[PDB]
Design a protein around this ligand. Structure first.
Ligand SMILES: COc1ccc(-c2c(-c3nc(CC(=O)NCC4CCOCC4)cs3)cnn2C(C)(C)C)cc1
Lengths: 15, 231
């Protein structure tokens, strides 16, 4: 899993 | 309490819907799955795995769950209205704490076991992680939480309050978040009063530091993946 911490939340929030 | 009684009852229901919709597995299914427990051969299978391999699997599961927590946040009445800086700040500080609450929620006190990858298993299942001090404290937190018997609605409101906390450093719209938090405290307070369980939050242990550590391990693996085997 390359994306983690704040980077995964940012990606997750875009929706 | 200026808010009318009917308006608060809806806020309870809206928050519970968001929690139930966004759990990875429905609680009712979790209780029904308590019968199937990993076989001693399956357990040893997990123990044979290399520290990295078991951490790599566990960290992916923490990140998957985080993603479902972000969805929970989106469903909160006022979360979308907040500026993206604030939306991100609240999720950085709190989203891992919710995760631990949701995973520790899928636990069985009778035989001290946790739902993990399809079947229930005990603390011994995690020996490959090699942080027994962390694993025993996490299982303790889960056992204490089980004693309190939180309902889905009580667990939905409490996790909601963890995310929507107005004291996190770096919030731009502090006042806007306090208003959203207060409304959740009003709601939750009413629900505890109706059921005579005002004292339950005092008895819950703090999971903040445990989650801080879990986040540190998740980050550790992403910083160092080039030194470990490829996906
Ligand atoms: C016993 O307490 C523990 C808590 C967490 C853990 C735990 C996990 C879990 N990964 C899953 C993956 C999974 O089965 N997902 C489906 C569930 C998710 C929760 O909601 C119900 C469906 C469940 S646990 C990953 N890392 N850790 C640490 C030990 C590092 C912390 C272990 C043990």
């Amino acid at each position: 899993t390359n994306m983690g911490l704040e980077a995964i939340i940012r990606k997750a929030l875009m929706g | 309490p200026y808010a009318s009684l009917t308006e608060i009852e809806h806020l309870v229901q809206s928050v519970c819907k968001s929690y139930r919709e966004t759990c990875q597995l429905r609680l009712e299914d979790l209780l029904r799955q308590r019968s199937n427990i990993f076989s001693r051969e399956e357990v040893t299978g997990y123990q044979r795995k290399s520290m990295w391999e078991m951490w790599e699997r566990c960290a992916h599961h923490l990140t998957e769950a985080i993603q479902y927590v972000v969805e929970f946040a989106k469903r909160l009445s006022g979360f979308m209205e907040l500026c993206q800086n604030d939306q991100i700040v609240l999720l950085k500080a709190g989203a891992m704490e919710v995760v631990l609450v949701r995973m520790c929620r899928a636990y069985n006190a009778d035989n001290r076991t946790v739902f993990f990858e399809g079947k229930y298993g005990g603390m011994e299942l995690f020996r490959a992680l090699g942080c027994s001090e962390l694993i025993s404290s996490i299982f303790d937190f889960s056992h204490s939480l089980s004693a309190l018997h939180f309902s889905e609605d009580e667990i939905a409101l409490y996790t909601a309050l963890v995310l929507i906390n107005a004291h996190r450093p770096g919030l731009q719209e502090k006042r806007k978040v306090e208003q959203l938090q207060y409304n959740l405290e009003l709601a939750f307070h009413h629900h505890l009063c109706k059921t005579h369980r005002q004292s339950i939050l005092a008895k819950l242990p703090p999971a903040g530091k445990l989650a801080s550590l879990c986040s540190q391990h998740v980050e550790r693996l992403q910083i160092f993946q080039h030194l470990h085997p490829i996906v």
